[PDB]
């Protein structure tokens, strides 16, 4: 029951001929599965971790200028030179300065003036990469057995460390069976080019070419003891005031500039090893061996009592906590809902089949009633506990919310959203292929466009579609305008 | 600032976004607009740091 009240869950009910269902585990969002004859169990991502970090392009963020030296040559007899300039430890650039009888020349004329300074490393900022092999994924598995206090519990569950070596794993649940996990870490994220840019006590996710494009001097990135920098002219400026001398300044500390720069980067944790959060992984669930506990259990007949208050969570599901009062340890709980005093029995018991394992402390049921005002009974007889409920909303509202949720899923998850909750249907695969090619062509156009610019481009193209002449107007307008507007509305999040 | 100085147009010296204070050097400056420098990040739901 780790999934209750998370604000991001999504029901994925369904199976296939050989009983697999695939699902993308968005980090920080847990998916819940259902079946006619299988237990409803909850899956949540946790702690995509890495090891054996490889470092390259160790940057520099603050300089230190020492050993200021300068050399001048008389006008019109060649450029000034310094034997010290060749060494890579020196930054040096020559301007022109007028040279006169007042500063010891032969004749009045412009002359070269090299000035060199000893750039020194200070507070380097390293950016490491990850060997793709070292990526490690952990998936927690919680089944919906109601315990005394297992509501949204996070430590409870069974970990399954899934690495690209062990793409397939078992999951030995207590007295339920083995849940199969087929995975595909290759398409989790393009980790072939991510860089883990570690700050003082922070670390981030960046794109490779952007990282190579940070306008700061860079080092070899190896474990050397005396790094040699390149493009050292960036962190040092030369002040040539009205052409009389040359002084050198170190241009301060670019820390805040960096913190402002990474305005779209995600976050990880750096504590010994780094547990990189913020990633999605698809997993083809295998429901081969799951079997319900207490299928042959006897349905007990006695009165029930409502220990805790009924309280409904977001997006339509309610929690019932009830303790059995009787003598049947193997009891299974009866359930039926009658709205309008009819026999409709409409709705779904979201939990598989609740059973009272032990009498003393309640086992808590979860169920999803229909939209209309519907009563819910539990036991049997006159004293059978009956609970009224009134869910607010209509079916069209649920449809609209589901559509919006699916759109948000598609925009963030790219081309894998069609793999989400699939069965293997021929229609679904073709839709995924078409959306994949179209979206790849689309994002090829907008690699690097921002919030407001995407909104404005969408407005411009929806206008050019609206007033155009030939039948391309509808294709351009609908497709590009709607896609760009809906991406501008929900991005950077 | 530090060992360096500059001349900037006055109208531009209040519109650059940073915290600012009365400049009374009373050892306990109560900074106006402290929100601009410090930044809150909220992870996926849950806590806040």
């Amino acid at each position: 029951m780790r999934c209750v009240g998370v604000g991001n869950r999504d029901f994925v009910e369904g199976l296939s001929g050989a009983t697999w269902v695939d699902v993308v585990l968005e980090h920080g969002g847990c998916v819940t599965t259902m079946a006619k004859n299988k237990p409803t169990l909850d899956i949540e991502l946790q702690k995509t971790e890495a090891t054996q970090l490889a470092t390259l392009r160790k940057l520099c963020i603050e300089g230190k200028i020492t050993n200021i030296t300068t050399d001048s040559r008389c006008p019109t007899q060649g450029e000034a030179v310094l034997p010290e300039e060749q060494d890579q430890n020196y930054v040096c650039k020559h301007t022109y300065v007028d040279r006169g009888w007042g500063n010891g020349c032969g004749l009045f004329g412009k002359g070269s003036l090299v000035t060199c300074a000893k750039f020194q490393c200070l507070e380097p900022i390293e950016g490491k990469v990850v060997q793709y092999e070292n990526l490690k994924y952990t998936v927690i598995i919680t089944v919906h057995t109601g315990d005394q206090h297992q509501v949204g519990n996070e430590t409870q569950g069974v970990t399954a460390e899934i690495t690209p070596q062990a793409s397939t794993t078992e999951a030995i649940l207590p007295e339920y069976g083995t849940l199969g996990l087929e995975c595909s870490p290759r398409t989790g994220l393009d980790f072939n080019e991510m860089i883990l840019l570690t700050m003082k006590n922070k670390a981030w996710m960046v794109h490779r070419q952007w990282f190579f494009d940070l306008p700061l001097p860079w080092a070899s990135g190896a474990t050397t003891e005396t790094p040699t920098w390149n493009r050292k002219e960036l962190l040092v400026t030369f002040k040539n005031a009205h052409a009389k001398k040359q002084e050198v300044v170190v241009l301060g500390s670019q820390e805040g500039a960096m913190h402002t720069a990474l305005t779209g980067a995600t976050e990880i944790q750096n504590s010994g090893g780094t547990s990189i959060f913020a990633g999605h992984l698809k997993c083809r669930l295998k429901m081969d061996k799951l079997e319900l506990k207490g299928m042959s259990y006897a349905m007990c007949t006695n009165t029930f009592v409502l220990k805790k208050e009924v309280s409904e969570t977001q997006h339509g599901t309610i929690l019932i906590k009830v303790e059995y009062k009787g003598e049947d340890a193997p009891c299974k709980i009866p359930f039926s809902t009658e709205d309008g005093q009819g026999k409709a029995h409409n709705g779904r018991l979201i939990t598989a089949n609740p059973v009272v394992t032990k009498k003393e402390e309640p086992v808590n049921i979860e169920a999803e009633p229909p939209f209309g005002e519907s009563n819910i009974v539990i036991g049997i007889g006159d004293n059978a506990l009956k609970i009224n409920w009134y869910k607010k909303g209509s079916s069209i509202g649920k449809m609209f919310e589901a559509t919006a949720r699916g759109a948000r899923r598609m925009a963030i998850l790219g081309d894998t959203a069609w793999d989400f909750g699939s069965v293997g249907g021929v229609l679904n695969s073709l839709g995924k292929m078409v959306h994949q090619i179209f979206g790849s062509a689309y994002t090829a156009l907008f690699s690097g466009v921002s919030w407001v610019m995407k909104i404005g481009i969408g407005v411009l193209l929806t206008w050019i579609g609206l007033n155009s002449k030939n039948t391309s107007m509808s294709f351009s307008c609908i497709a590009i305008g709607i896609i760009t507007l809906y991406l501008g509305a929900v991005v950077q999040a | 600032m530090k060992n360096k100085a500059w001349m900037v147009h006055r109208q531009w010296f209040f519109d650059l976004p940073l915290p600012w204070a009365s400049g009374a050097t009373t050892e306990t400056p109560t900074w106006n607009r402290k929100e601009l420098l410090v930044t809150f990040k909220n992870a996926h739901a849950k806590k806040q740091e």
Epitope: C121, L122, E123, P124, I125, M199, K200, N201 | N3
Partner: antibody
């Protein structure tokens, strides 16, 4: 409490590298500085360079870049300094001190160790 | 620039003697000065962990501040146990290094 053992004094010959270990426990070592100030007999003491344990590089005094090196480890909370070249000049006791990262606190050397001593001779 | 402080003598009767520290326009005129006294032969301790703030040094008799390019320290009721070398150290911001002084041989009679 917070202190720096600074191991024990050792003396060597010219032309070889010597090491001075310097461990400070009792507090979170990451945030604070290590300064490595040298002190000659009957002379004033001059500071050379910081080392930030978490991410810091060497920032030696202009007299001493390319003359000394500084390393550290975060797991054991110890800062290492070694002398890549021993001339006849460096005949003194080398220190450690905790420094703050405040602009007014770059010279804030609140805590000091015993002082590992090294001299060079034939 | 670079800081230079003079060595001087004093006597065990209580008297105000000023250990003046002189610097420049980039090292001490803008930054917090730090005052150290060392018992000879061992590790120097810190006497003033701010411009005019003492962490745990002998209170009410060790107090000083800085004026423009000069920083100073004042000691009152100086006895023999205060035999120490006094150091003023300031952070140079142009050269990105702290600037320790030569040292004062403060001898008290």
């Amino acid at each position: 409490q917070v202190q720096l053992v600074q191991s024990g004094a050792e003396v060597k010959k010219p032309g070889a590298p010597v090491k001075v270990s310097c461990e400070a426990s009792g507090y979170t070592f990451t945030d604070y500085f290590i300064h490595w100030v040298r002190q000659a007999p009957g002379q004033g003491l001059e500071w050379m360079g910081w080392i930030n344990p978490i991410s810091g590089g060497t920032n030696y005094h202009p007299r001493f870049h390319g003359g000394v090196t500084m390393t550290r480890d975060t797991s054991m909370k110890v800062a290492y300094m070694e002398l890549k070249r021993l001339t006849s000049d460096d005949t003194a006791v080398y220190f450690c001190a905790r420094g703050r990262d405040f602009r007014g606190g770059y010279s804030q050397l609140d805590y000091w160790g015993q002082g590992t001593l090294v001299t060079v001779s034939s | 620039s670079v800081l230079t402080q003079p060595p001087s003598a004093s006597g065990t009767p209580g008297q105000r003697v000023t250990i003046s520290c002189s610097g420049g326009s980039s090292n001490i005129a803008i930054n917090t000065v730090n005052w150290y006294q060392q018992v000879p032969g061992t590790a120097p301790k810190l006497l003033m962990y701010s411009n005019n703030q003492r962490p745990s040094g002998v209170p009410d008799r060790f107090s000083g501040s800085k004026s423009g390019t000069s920083a100073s320290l004042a000691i009152s009721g100086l006895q023999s146990e205060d035999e120490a070398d006094y150091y003023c150290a300031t952070w140079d911001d142009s050269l990105k290094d702290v600037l320790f002084g030569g040292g004062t041989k403060l001898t008290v009679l």
